[PDB]
């Protein structure tokens, strides 16, 4: 789920940039720092919209650097358990289906698929299908999935989804 939240980050500055363009290099470093990161407490950080304020930096004794507390408003994508979201199928195989929700990637286990669906190794594009073949999900399809779990890996949370509930299928 995408969110707009205000966060705070302290950027260290080498005395090299104690020049007229200091405030600009401060925000440039903030952008380079926070953008693209992921955290369990706040989820993925998609982009930095604005900078609310730059605090007065401090000179740390002995060290040359100056530290600035930079409060900033950013876009974050945090999923949740029990949440229905759209996803994009990117690879389909016999084991299951692999989808993407923004930066996150999801894998749908056989126990999360309705009993009508059955694995078919014989098909050239592997896919999930039932005998009626009313609904067919293949690569690049749009699906609606329920998030069942959250697992954080190397500062990168990954989620497992589900489509087992009613009305969750290719629309």
């Amino acid at each position: 789920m995408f969110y707009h939240i205000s966060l705070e980050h302290e950027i260290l500055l080498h005395p090299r940039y104690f020049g007229p363009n200091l405030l600009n290099t401060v925000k440039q470093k903030l952008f380079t720092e926070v953008e693209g990161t992921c955290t369990g407490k706040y989820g993925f950080v998609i982009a930095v919209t604005t900078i609310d304020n730059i605090g007065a930096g401090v000179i740390q004794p002995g060290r040359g650097f100056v530290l600035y507390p930079v409060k900033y408003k950013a876009i974050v994508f945090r999923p949740f358990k029990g949440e229905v979201v759209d996803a994009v199928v990117t690879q389909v195989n016999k084991v299951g289906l692999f989808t993407e929700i923004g930066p996150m990637s999801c894998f749908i286990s056989r126990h999360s698929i309705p009993s009508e669906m059955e694995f078919d190794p014989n098909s050239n594009p592997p896919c999930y299908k039932t005998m009626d073949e009313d609904i067919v999900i293949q690569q690049d399809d749009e699906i609606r999935l329920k998030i069942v779990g959250t697992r954080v890996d190397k500062n990168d949370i990954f989620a497992i989804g589900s489509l087992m509930d009613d009305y969750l299928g290719l629309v």
Binding site: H14, P15, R16, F18, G19, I59, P61, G62, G64
Partner: protein
């Protein structure tokens, strides 16, 4: 402690002088842009002393009161005796 009425001494203390000169010298040594004409000067401490006499050190002294508040003084707003 609104800087409208700063109640601490308008003179830079000897401790403030010592620490400001040292901190600015370290900054110069780390290629911080200089604020005065260096004509034939190379030692970072001597350059920092020149900047102090010129009232050009880009540093603010934050003086904490016992009560917990503080006052911010630009290094150029203080009287330098020694």
């Amino acid at each position: 402690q609104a800087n409208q009425k700063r109640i601490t001494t308008p003179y830079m203390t000897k401790y403030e002088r010592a620490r400001v000169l040292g901190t600015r010298a370290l900054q110069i040594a780390m290629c911080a842009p200089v604020m005065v004409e260096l004509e034939g000067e190379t030692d970072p401490l001597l350059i920092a002393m020149k900047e102090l006499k010129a009232r050009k050190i880009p540093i603010i002294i934050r003086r904490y009161l016992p009560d917990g508040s503080y006052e911010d003084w630009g290094v150029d707003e203080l009287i330098i005796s020694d």
